Design a protein around this nucleic acid. Structure first.
Length: 247
DNA sequence: CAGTAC
DNA sequence: GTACTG
């Protein structure tokens, strides 16, 4: 087939971008079968190709709830005080979700620890998590999992699921980042940059020092932000509910 | 770098 | 913009 469509075909593989798609085209690959049989694949790339059709589908919002609930009960078995809030497209109220991002924390700020591994293991035993892509357990106090899940029963597709465990100290900035949207987050951190601050999935800092070129040369001091709206306030912004946030 | 998360 | 692993 023509160049542009084939590049698009390859790019829709998880773990494959515009550079990988271009390289594969030079090798002479045109179809997904060519990639599956001849191309050197990353473990992640192998999974994305395996679930190519299912990953292209957006899911009904109801299914996202059904997934968030599946994770929630698995975690709450270990600790019933645990919080489980689905973010991303879901929290912003979209009728469809391309994936599910479940955020987890605990009010005491202690018992959230030691859940991440046990939770994933519990979900693997349940048959819920089917494949794993990336696991980053050295996010400072946060841990993030990138994997694939599938609800039980006939006629179920594989969905992409993100699970994140944060301390209650960072709960505000954690879901502020994960509900998005991406170009909402982009402009809040850009805004803080102007106000001499920095925003992140961990904290909103003030007093951040930047050089003449604006490169950050000193971190600021972390401002305690219990809720989302505390963050909105310190940035001199009118608050936006998540639905307002999609953009 | 490349791809990814929002 | 901020920031993680492949």
């Amino acid at each position: 087939s023509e160049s542009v469509p084939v590049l698009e075909l390859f790019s829709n593989i998880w773990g494959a971008g515009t550079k990988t798609a271009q390289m594969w085209y030079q090798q002479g690959f045109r179809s997904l079968e060519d990639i599956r049989s001849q191309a050197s694949l990353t473990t992640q790339q192998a999974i994305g190709l395996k679930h190519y059709s299912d990953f292209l589908e957006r899911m009904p919002r109801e299914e996202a709830t059904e997934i968030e609930q599946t994770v929630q009960k698995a975690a709450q078995a270990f600790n019933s005080g645990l919080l489980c809030v689905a973010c991303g497209s879901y929290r912003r109220g979209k009728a469809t979700c391309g994936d599910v991002d479940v955020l987890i924390t605990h009010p005491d700020g202690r018992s959230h620890r030691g859940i991440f591994s046990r939770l994933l293991d519990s979900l693997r035993q349940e048959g819920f998590l089917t494949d794993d892509l990336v696991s980053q357990e050295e996010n400072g106090q946060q841990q993030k999992y990138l994997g694939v899940c599938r609800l039980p029963g006939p006629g179920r597709r594989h969905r992409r699921l993100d699970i994140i465990v944060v301390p209650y100290s960072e709960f505000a900035c954690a879901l502020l980042y994960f509900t998005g949207s991406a170009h909402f987050n982009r402009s809040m951190r850009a805004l803080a940059k102007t106000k001499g601050m920095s925003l992140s999935e961990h904290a909103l800092s003030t007093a951040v020092v930047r050089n003449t070129h604006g490169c950050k040369v000193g971190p600021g001091r972390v401002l305690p932000t219990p809720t989302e709206k505390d963050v909105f306030r310190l940035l001199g912004l009118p608050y936006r509910e998540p639905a307002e946030r999609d953009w």
